[PDB]
Amino acid sequence: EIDPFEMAVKQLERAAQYMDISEEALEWLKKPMRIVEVSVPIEMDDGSVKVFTGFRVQHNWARGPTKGGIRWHPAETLSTVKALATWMTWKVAVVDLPYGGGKGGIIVNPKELSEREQERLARAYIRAVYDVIGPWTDIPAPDVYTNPKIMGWMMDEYETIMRRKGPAFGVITGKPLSIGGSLGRGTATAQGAIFTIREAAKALGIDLKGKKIAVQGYGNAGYYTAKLAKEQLGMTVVAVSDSRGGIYNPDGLDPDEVLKWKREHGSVKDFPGATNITNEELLELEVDVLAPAAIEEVITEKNADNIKAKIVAEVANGPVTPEADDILREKGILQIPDFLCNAGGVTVSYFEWVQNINGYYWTEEEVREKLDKKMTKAFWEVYNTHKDKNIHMRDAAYVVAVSRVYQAMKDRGWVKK
Ligand SMILES: NC(=O)C1=CN([C@@H]2O[C@H](COP(=O)(O)OP(=O)(O)OC[C@H]3O[C@@H](n4cnc5c(N)ncnc54)[C@H](OP(=O)(O)O)[C@@H]3O)[C@@H](O)[C@H]2O)C=CC1
Ligand SMILES: N[C@@H](CCC(=O)O)C(=O)O
Ligand SMILES: O=C(O)CCC(=O)C(=O)O
C-alpha cells in the first residue's frame, strides 16, 4: 500500500534523475545513517507500568546536527519516521540551514493519557534517547499531537541528565518563551509563505497590491496566511474555507472577523455578506494567488486543468499530485513547492536554536527580517534552477537540496565520487 519509505526513496531517485550524482552517493542517501528504536516505560496513574515503542531516526548529518520533530500517534511506524526524516533532510537543505535530517516518534494514543502520564512519557523518551541527541547532535521539535509543553518537559529532563554542562536550552526547539523560547514561532509558516509569494510575484512581474487570493483551510497556517497577505502584500482575501465548507466575497474578507465568527459559530460558513461555496468551488475561482493550507492531495488530475490561479502557494504538505503538477506547469502557472513554501517553521526553529546556543535572544523584527532574507534567497535559488534546467519547480527544489547534501558529503570525504 505504497510504503512511506518506498515513496521517499522513489522521490529521491526521481530527483537524482535530473542531476549529476554518483551511484555511491545515491546509495548513501537511500539509507538513514542511524536508526534508534527504544522502549519507553512509564508508570500509569493506576500504578501499573506500560512500555511504549519510541523511535529516533537520523537520516543524514553531513551539513550539521540533525533536525526534526517527534510524533505521538497510535499509528506510528518506523517506516513513517524514516520517510519523514528523509524529507526533513531536504527541507533543511533547500533553505540552506546547517542541519541534517532527523525524526522521532512514540506509538501511543495521547488522547487517553493524563497530564502526569504525558510528562512521564516525555521524560522517559528523553532518558531513552539521551545518548543520540544533543545541542550539536540532534534537535527535536514539536509535531503531530505534541506541543511546547512537552518540549519544556523534555528540555527539563535533558538538562537534569546533562547536569547543566552546556546549552541545554538548545537541545530542543518549540519551547515556551519563559524557557528558551523564540518570538515569531506562531506565524512562522505563514510568514515564510508570504515572503515566497511576494518573491514569486516579483519573478512573474505582478504587483500584488489590489489582487485576489483564495486560501483553503483556515487553521493556524491558513488564517495567518490570509491575514499576513492582506496586511503586508495588500492582497484582497476573497475566499476562505474550513472542513465544513467555504465562503466567497468579491469585495473582500476581514480575516479577524472571519476568525471571530469561526470561533463563535464553530465554522467559517454562513459568514455575513459572504456566499457559501464548496472547497472544490474555491479551487475553481479566478484568483492570482491560491494557498492550499489544508488536507493533502486537494489538487489532482481531475481538477488540475480547471485551476485559474497564477501562483499556487503549497502552504500545506503536498496538496498537488505529480499529474496535477505536470498539468499545472503546462498551463503556464508557477508553483511554489510544498517543502519550500512552508519552510518558515523549520527556519524559525533554527533561529530559536541559534538564540539558545548564543545565549542572546532576538526580537520580533529581527526574526522577521532574517526569515525574510532566508526565504528570499531560497526561493530565488530554486527559481534560478527552475529556469536554467527547464524542469518543474518541485524538481528544481529537490535538485538544490540534494546538491547541497551531496556537496557536503563530498567535502567531508564520505563519498569519493
Ligand atoms: N501551522 C504550522 O505551524 C505548520 C503547518 N504545516 C502544514 O500546514 C497545514 C495547516 O497547518 P495547521 O494550521 O497546523 O493545521 P490546523 O490543524 O491548525 O488547521 C487545519 C485547517 O484545515 C482545515 N481542514 C482539515 N481538513 C480539511 C479538508 N479535508 N478540507 C478543507 N479544510 C480542511 C481545518 O478545518 P476545521 O477548522 O474545520 O477543522 C482547519 O481549518 C497542514 O497541511 C500542515 O501539514 C506544517 C508546518 C508547520
Ligand atoms: N517537525 C516540524 C518542526 C520543525 C523542526 O523540525 O525543527 C517541521 O518540520 O516544521
Ligand atoms: O509534520 C509537520 O511538520 C506538520 C504536519 C501537520 O501539521 C499536519 O500533518 O497537519
Coordinates of C-alpha atoms and ligand atoms in Angstrom, one line a residue:
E1 CA 0.0 0.0 0.0
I2 CA 2.8 2.4 -1.0
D3 CA 5.1 2.3 2.0
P4 CA 6.2 5.8 3.1
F5 CA 9.9 4.9 2.9
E6 CA 9.4 3.4 -0.5
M7 CA 7.8 6.6 -1.7
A8 CA 10.6 8.7 -0.2
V9 CA 13.2 6.5 -1.9
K10 CA 11.3 6.8 -5.2
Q11 CA 11.2 10.6 -4.9
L12 CA 14.9 10.7 -4.2
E13 CA 15.7 8.6 -7.3
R14 CA 13.4 10.8 -9.4
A15 CA 15.3 13.8 -8.1
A16 CA 18.7 12.2 -8.8
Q17 CA 17.5 11.5 -12.4
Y18 CA 17.6 15.3 -13.0
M19 CA 21.1 15.9 -11.7
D20 CA 24.6 14.6 -11.9
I21 CA 25.1 12.4 -8.7
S22 CA 27.3 9.4 -8.2
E23 CA 25.8 5.9 -7.5
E24 CA 27.6 5.6 -4.2
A25 CA 26.2 9.0 -3.0
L26 CA 22.7 7.9 -4.0
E27 CA 23.1 4.6 -2.2
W28 CA 24.3 6.5 0.9
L29 CA 21.3 8.9 0.7
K30 CA 18.8 6.0 0.3
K31 CA 19.6 4.8 3.8
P32 CA 19.3 6.6 7.1
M33 CA 22.7 6.9 8.8
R34 CA 21.4 6.0 12.3
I35 CA 18.1 4.5 13.5
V36 CA 17.4 4.1 17.2
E37 CA 14.4 2.1 18.5
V38 CA 14.0 2.1 22.3
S39 CA 11.5 1.0 24.8
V40 CA 9.8 3.8 26.7
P41 CA 8.4 2.6 30.1
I42 CA 6.2 4.9 32.2
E43 CA 4.2 4.4 35.4
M44 CA 0.4 4.6 34.8
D45 CA -1.9 6.6 37.1
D46 CA -3.3 3.3 38.4
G47 CA 0.2 2.3 39.5
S48 CA 0.9 -0.1 36.6
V49 CA 3.9 0.1 34.3
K50 CA 3.4 0.3 30.5
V51 CA 6.1 0.1 27.9
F52 CA 5.9 2.1 24.7
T53 CA 7.9 2.0 21.5
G54 CA 9.9 5.1 20.6
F55 CA 11.9 5.9 17.6
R56 CA 14.7 8.4 16.7
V57 CA 15.9 8.3 13.1
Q58 CA 18.9 10.4 12.0
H59 CA 18.9 10.2 8.2
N60 CA 22.0 12.3 7.4
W61 CA 24.2 14.8 9.3
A62 CA 26.7 15.9 6.6
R63 CA 25.6 19.6 6.8
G64 CA 25.3 19.6 10.6
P65 CA 23.2 18.4 13.6
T66 CA 20.0 16.7 12.5
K67 CA 16.7 18.4 13.0
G68 CA 13.2 17.0 13.2
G69 CA 10.0 16.6 15.3
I70 CA 8.6 13.9 17.5
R71 CA 5.2 12.4 16.6
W72 CA 2.8 10.9 19.2
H73 CA 0.4 8.9 17.1
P74 CA -1.2 5.5 17.7
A75 CA -0.4 4.6 14.0
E76 CA 3.3 5.5 14.2
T77 CA 5.7 3.2 12.3
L78 CA 9.5 3.1 11.9
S79 CA 8.9 3.4 8.1
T80 CA 7.0 6.6 8.6
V81 CA 9.7 8.1 10.9
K82 CA 12.4 7.1 8.4
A83 CA 10.5 8.7 5.5
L84 CA 9.8 11.9 7.4
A85 CA 13.5 12.1 8.4
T86 CA 14.5 11.8 4.8
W87 CA 12.0 14.5 3.8
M88 CA 13.3 16.7 6.7
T89 CA 16.8 16.4 5.3
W90 CA 15.7 18.0 2.0
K91 CA 13.5 20.5 3.9
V92 CA 16.5 21.8 5.8
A93 CA 18.8 21.6 2.8
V94 CA 16.6 23.6 0.4
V95 CA 16.5 26.7 2.7
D96 CA 20.3 26.4 3.4
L97 CA 20.3 25.6 7.1
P98 CA 23.4 24.0 8.8
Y99 CA 21.2 21.0 9.7
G100 CA 20.7 17.4 8.8
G101 CA 17.6 15.2 8.8
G102 CA 16.0 13.7 11.9
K103 CA 12.7 12.4 13.2
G104 CA 11.2 10.8 16.2
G105 CA 8.0 9.1 17.3
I106 CA 6.2 7.1 20.0
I107 CA 3.5 4.6 19.2
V108 CA 0.9 5.9 21.7
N109 CA -2.6 7.4 21.8
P110 CA -2.1 10.6 23.7
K111 CA -5.9 11.2 24.0
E112 CA -6.1 8.5 26.7
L113 CA -3.1 9.8 28.7
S114 CA -3.3 12.3 31.6
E115 CA -1.0 15.3 32.1
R116 CA 1.2 13.4 34.6
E117 CA 1.3 10.4 32.3
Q118 CA 2.3 12.6 29.3
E119 CA 5.0 14.2 31.3
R120 CA 6.3 10.8 32.4
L121 CA 6.2 9.7 28.7
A122 CA 8.3 12.7 27.6
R123 CA 10.8 12.3 30.4
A124 CA 11.2 8.5 29.7
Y125 CA 11.6 9.2 26.0
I126 CA 14.4 11.7 26.8
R127 CA 16.0 9.1 29.2
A128 CA 15.9 6.5 26.4
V129 CA 17.2 8.6 23.6
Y130 CA 19.7 10.8 25.5
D131 CA 22.7 9.1 24.0
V132 CA 21.9 10.1 20.5
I133 CA 20.6 13.7 21.0
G134 CA 22.1 17.0 22.0
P135 CA 22.5 20.7 21.1
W136 CA 25.1 19.8 18.4
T137 CA 23.9 16.2 17.6
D138 CA 20.1 16.1 17.3
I139 CA 17.5 18.8 18.0
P140 CA 13.9 17.5 18.4
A141 CA 10.8 19.7 17.7
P142 CA 7.0 19.8 18.1
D143 CA 4.9 17.6 15.7
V144 CA 1.5 16.0 15.5
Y145 CA -0.1 15.6 18.9
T146 CA 2.9 17.2 20.5
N147 CA 3.1 20.8 21.9
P148 CA 5.5 23.3 23.6
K149 CA 4.5 21.9 27.0
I150 CA 6.1 18.5 26.1
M151 CA 9.1 20.5 24.7
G152 CA 9.5 22.1 28.1
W153 CA 9.3 18.8 29.9
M154 CA 11.8 17.2 27.5
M155 CA 14.2 20.1 27.9
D156 CA 14.0 20.0 31.7
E157 CA 14.7 16.2 31.7
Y158 CA 17.6 16.7 29.3
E159 CA 19.1 19.4 31.5
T160 CA 18.7 17.3 34.6
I161 CA 20.6 14.4 32.9
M162 CA 23.2 16.6 31.4
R163 CA 24.0 18.3 34.8
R164 CA 23.9 21.8 33.1
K165 CA 27.2 21.3 31.4
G166 CA 26.2 23.3 28.3
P167 CA 23.4 24.9 26.3
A168 CA 20.6 22.5 27.4
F169 CA 18.1 25.1 26.1
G170 CA 19.3 24.4 22.6
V171 CA 18.7 20.6 22.7
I172 CA 15.1 21.1 21.6
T173 CA 13.1 23.8 19.9
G174 CA 9.5 24.9 20.1
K175 CA 9.9 25.6 23.8
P176 CA 7.8 28.1 25.8
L177 CA 9.1 31.7 25.8
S178 CA 9.8 31.5 29.5
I179 CA 12.4 28.8 28.9
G180 CA 14.5 29.4 25.8
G181 CA 11.5 30.1 23.5
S182 CA 11.6 32.3 20.4
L183 CA 9.5 35.1 19.0
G184 CA 7.6 34.6 15.8
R185 CA 7.1 30.9 16.1
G186 CA 3.3 31.2 15.9
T187 CA 3.3 32.8 12.5
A188 CA 6.5 31.2 11.0
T189 CA 4.9 29.1 8.3
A190 CA 2.6 31.9 7.1
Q191 CA 5.4 34.5 7.2
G192 CA 7.6 32.2 5.0
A193 CA 4.7 31.6 2.6
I194 CA 4.0 35.3 2.3
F195 CA 7.7 36.0 1.6
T196 CA 7.7 33.3 -1.1
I197 CA 4.5 34.6 -2.6
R198 CA 6.0 38.1 -2.8
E199 CA 9.1 36.8 -4.4
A200 CA 7.1 34.7 -6.9
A201 CA 5.0 37.8 -7.8
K202 CA 8.3 39.7 -8.3
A203 CA 9.6 37.0 -10.6
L204 CA 6.4 36.9 -12.6
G205 CA 6.3 40.7 -12.7
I206 CA 2.9 41.0 -11.0
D207 CA 2.0 43.7 -8.5
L208 CA 0.1 42.1 -5.6
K209 CA -1.4 45.4 -4.4
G210 CA -5.1 45.1 -5.3
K211 CA -5.1 41.4 -6.3
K212 CA -7.1 38.5 -5.1
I213 CA -6.1 35.5 -3.0
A214 CA -8.0 32.4 -2.0
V215 CA -7.0 30.2 1.0
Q216 CA -8.2 26.6 1.5
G217 CA -8.1 25.7 5.2
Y218 CA -8.5 28.3 7.9
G219 CA -6.4 26.8 10.8
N220 CA -3.3 28.5 12.2
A221 CA -1.4 28.4 8.8
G222 CA -4.4 29.4 6.6
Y223 CA -5.7 32.2 8.9
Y224 CA -2.3 33.7 9.4
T225 CA -1.5 33.4 5.7
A226 CA -4.7 35.3 4.8
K227 CA -4.1 37.9 7.5
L228 CA -0.4 38.5 6.6
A229 CA -1.3 38.6 2.9
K230 CA -3.9 41.3 3.5
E231 CA -1.7 43.3 5.9
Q232 CA 1.7 43.2 4.1
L233 CA 1.1 42.2 0.5
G234 CA -2.1 44.3 0.2
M235 CA -4.0 41.4 -1.4
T236 CA -7.8 41.2 -1.2
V237 CA -8.9 38.0 0.5
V238 CA -12.0 36.8 -1.4
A239 CA -12.4 33.2 -0.2
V240 CA -11.5 31.1 2.8
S241 CA -12.6 27.6 3.8
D242 CA -12.7 25.0 6.7
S243 CA -13.5 21.3 6.9
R244 CA -17.2 22.1 6.9
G245 CA -17.2 24.4 3.9
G246 CA -16.1 27.7 2.4
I247 CA -17.2 31.3 1.8
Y248 CA -16.8 33.8 -1.0
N249 CA -17.0 37.5 -1.3
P250 CA -15.5 39.5 -4.3
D251 CA -15.5 42.7 -2.2
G252 CA -13.1 41.2 0.3
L253 CA -12.9 39.5 3.7
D254 CA -11.6 40.6 7.0
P255 CA -9.6 37.8 8.5
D256 CA -10.1 38.9 12.1
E257 CA -13.9 38.9 11.7
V258 CA -13.9 35.6 10.0
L259 CA -11.8 34.1 12.8
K260 CA -14.2 35.6 15.3
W261 CA -17.1 34.1 13.5
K262 CA -15.4 30.7 13.3
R263 CA -14.6 30.8 17.0
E264 CA -18.2 31.7 17.7
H265 CA -20.2 29.6 15.2
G266 CA -17.7 26.7 15.1
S267 CA -17.2 27.1 11.4
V268 CA -16.5 29.8 8.7
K269 CA -19.8 29.0 6.9
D270 CA -22.7 31.4 6.9
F271 CA -20.4 34.5 7.4
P272 CA -22.4 37.7 6.9
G273 CA -22.1 39.2 3.4
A274 CA -20.4 36.1 2.0
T275 CA -21.7 33.5 -0.4
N276 CA -21.3 29.9 0.7
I277 CA -19.1 27.8 -1.6
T278 CA -17.6 24.3 -1.5
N279 CA -13.9 23.6 -1.3
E280 CA -13.9 22.3 -4.8
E281 CA -15.6 25.5 -5.9
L282 CA -13.0 27.6 -4.2
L283 CA -10.3 25.8 -6.2
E284 CA -12.2 26.9 -9.3
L285 CA -12.1 30.7 -8.6
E286 CA -10.2 33.0 -10.8
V287 CA -7.6 34.4 -8.5
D288 CA -3.9 35.4 -8.7
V289 CA -2.7 33.6 -5.6
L290 CA -4.0 30.2 -4.3
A291 CA -2.8 28.9 -0.9
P292 CA -4.0 25.4 -0.1
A293 CA -3.3 25.2 3.7
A294 CA -5.3 22.1 4.4
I295 CA -5.6 18.3 3.8
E296 CA -3.1 16.5 1.5
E297 CA -4.0 16.0 -2.2
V298 CA -6.6 18.6 -2.8
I299 CA -5.4 19.2 -6.4
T300 CA -5.5 16.1 -8.6
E301 CA -5.5 15.3 -12.3
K302 CA -9.3 15.7 -12.3
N303 CA -9.3 19.4 -11.3
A304 CA -5.8 20.4 -12.3
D305 CA -7.0 21.8 -15.7
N306 CA -9.8 23.9 -14.1
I307 CA -7.4 26.0 -11.9
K308 CA -7.2 29.6 -12.8
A309 CA -4.7 30.8 -10.2
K310 CA -1.5 32.4 -11.4
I311 CA 0.5 31.4 -8.3
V312 CA -0.2 28.2 -6.2
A313 CA 1.5 28.5 -2.8
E314 CA 1.6 25.0 -1.5
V315 CA 1.4 26.0 2.2
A316 CA 0.2 22.5 3.2
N317 CA 2.2 19.3 2.9
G318 CA 1.8 18.2 -0.7
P319 CA -1.6 19.5 -1.8
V320 CA -0.7 18.9 -5.5
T321 CA -0.2 15.5 -7.2
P322 CA 2.5 14.8 -9.8
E323 CA -0.1 14.5 -12.6
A324 CA -1.6 17.8 -11.4
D325 CA 1.9 19.1 -11.2
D326 CA 2.5 18.4 -14.9
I327 CA -0.9 19.7 -15.9
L328 CA -0.5 22.9 -13.9
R329 CA 3.0 23.5 -15.3
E330 CA 1.7 23.0 -18.8
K331 CA -0.8 25.8 -18.2
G332 CA 2.0 28.3 -17.5
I333 CA 1.3 28.5 -13.8
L334 CA 4.1 28.9 -11.3
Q335 CA 4.0 26.5 -8.3
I336 CA 5.9 27.1 -5.1
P337 CA 6.9 23.6 -3.8
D338 CA 5.4 22.5 -0.5
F339 CA 8.7 22.0 1.4
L340 CA 9.9 25.4 0.2
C341 CA 6.7 27.4 0.8
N342 CA 6.2 26.2 4.4
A343 CA 9.9 26.2 5.3
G344 CA 9.3 29.1 7.6
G345 CA 8.6 26.9 10.6
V346 CA 11.9 25.0 10.4
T347 CA 13.8 28.2 9.7
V348 CA 12.3 29.8 12.8
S349 CA 13.2 26.7 14.8
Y350 CA 16.7 27.1 13.6
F351 CA 16.6 30.7 14.7
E352 CA 15.5 29.6 18.1
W353 CA 18.3 27.1 18.3
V354 CA 20.8 29.8 17.4
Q355 CA 19.4 32.1 20.1
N356 CA 19.6 29.3 22.7
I357 CA 23.2 28.4 21.6
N358 CA 24.3 32.0 21.7
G359 CA 22.6 32.9 24.9
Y360 CA 21.2 36.1 23.3
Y361 CA 17.6 36.4 22.2
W362 CA 16.2 38.5 19.4
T363 CA 13.0 40.5 18.9
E364 CA 10.1 40.1 16.5
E365 CA 11.5 42.5 13.9
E366 CA 14.9 40.8 13.8
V367 CA 13.4 37.3 13.4
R368 CA 11.1 38.7 10.7
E369 CA 13.9 40.2 8.7
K370 CA 16.2 37.2 9.0
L371 CA 13.3 34.9 7.9
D372 CA 12.7 37.3 5.0
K373 CA 16.3 37.0 3.9
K374 CA 16.4 33.2 4.2
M375 CA 13.1 32.7 2.3
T376 CA 14.0 35.2 -0.4
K377 CA 17.4 33.5 -1.0
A378 CA 15.9 30.0 -1.0
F379 CA 13.1 30.9 -3.4
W380 CA 15.5 32.7 -5.8
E381 CA 17.9 29.8 -5.8
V382 CA 15.0 27.3 -6.6
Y383 CA 13.6 29.6 -9.3
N384 CA 17.0 30.0 -10.9
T385 CA 17.4 26.3 -11.0
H386 CA 13.9 26.0 -12.4
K387 CA 14.7 28.5 -15.2
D388 CA 18.2 27.0 -16.0
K389 CA 17.3 23.3 -16.0
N390 CA 13.9 23.7 -17.6
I391 CA 12.3 21.4 -15.1
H392 CA 9.5 21.7 -12.6
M393 CA 9.8 23.9 -9.5
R394 CA 9.5 20.9 -7.3
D395 CA 12.2 19.1 -9.2
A396 CA 14.4 22.2 -9.0
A397 CA 13.9 22.4 -5.2
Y398 CA 14.8 18.7 -4.9
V399 CA 17.9 19.2 -7.1
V400 CA 19.0 22.1 -5.0
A401 CA 18.6 20.2 -1.7
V402 CA 20.2 17.0 -2.9
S403 CA 23.1 19.0 -4.5
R404 CA 23.7 20.8 -1.2
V405 CA 23.7 17.5 0.7
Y406 CA 25.9 15.8 -1.9
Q407 CA 28.4 18.7 -1.8
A408 CA 28.6 18.5 2.0
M409 CA 29.1 14.7 1.8
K410 CA 31.9 15.1 -0.8
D411 CA 33.6 17.8 1.3
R412 CA 33.7 15.6 4.4
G413 CA 35.2 12.8 2.3
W414 CA 32.3 10.4 2.9
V415 CA 32.0 9.8 -0.9
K416 CA 35.0 9.9 -3.2
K417 CA 33.0 10.4 -6.5
Ligands
LIG1 N1 0.7 25.6 11.1 C1 2.1 25.2 11.1 O1 2.8 25.5 12.1 C2 2.8 24.4 10.1 C3 1.9 23.8 9.2 N2 2.1 22.7 8.3 C4 1.2 22.3 7.3 O2 0.2 23.2 7.1 C5 -1.2 23.0 7.0 C6 -2.0 23.5 8.1 O3 -1.3 23.7 9.4 P1 -2.2 23.9 10.7 O4 -2.6 25.3 10.8 O5 -1.4 23.4 11.9 O6 -3.5 23.0 10.6 P2 -4.7 23.1 11.6 O7 -4.9 21.8 12.3 O8 -4.3 24.2 12.7 O9 -6.0 23.6 10.9 C7 -6.5 22.8 9.8 C8 -7.4 23.6 8.9 O10 -7.6 23.0 7.7 C9 -8.9 22.6 7.7 N3 -9.1 21.3 7.2 C10 -8.7 19.9 7.7 N4 -9.1 19.0 6.7 C11 -9.7 19.8 5.6 C12 -10.3 19.4 4.5 N5 -10.3 18.0 4.2 N6 -10.8 20.2 3.7 C13 -10.8 21.5 3.9 N7 -10.3 22.1 5.1 C14 -9.7 21.1 5.9 C15 -9.4 22.7 9.1 O11 -10.7 22.9 9.2 P3 -11.5 22.9 10.6 O12 -11.1 24.0 11.4 O13 -13.0 23.0 10.3 O14 -11.2 21.6 11.3 C16 -8.7 23.9 9.6 O15 -9.3 25.0 9.0 C17 -1.1 21.5 7.1 O16 -1.2 20.9 5.8 C18 0.3 21.2 7.7 O17 0.8 20.0 7.2 C19 3.4 22.2 8.6 C20 4.4 23.1 9.0 C21 4.1 23.8 10.3
LIG2 N1 8.6 19.0 12.5 C1 8.3 20.4 12.4 C2 9.2 21.2 13.4 C3 10.4 21.9 12.7 C4 11.7 21.3 13.0 O1 11.9 20.1 12.6 O2 12.5 22.0 13.7 C5 8.5 20.9 11.0 O3 9.1 20.1 10.2 O4 8.1 22.0 10.7
LIG3 O1 4.8 17.4 10.3 C1 4.8 18.6 10.4 O2 5.8 19.4 10.4 C2 3.4 19.3 10.4 C3 2.4 18.3 9.9 C4 1.0 18.8 10.0 O3 0.8 19.9 10.5 C5 -0.2 18.1 9.5 O4 0.0 16.9 9.0 O5 -1.3 18.6 9.6

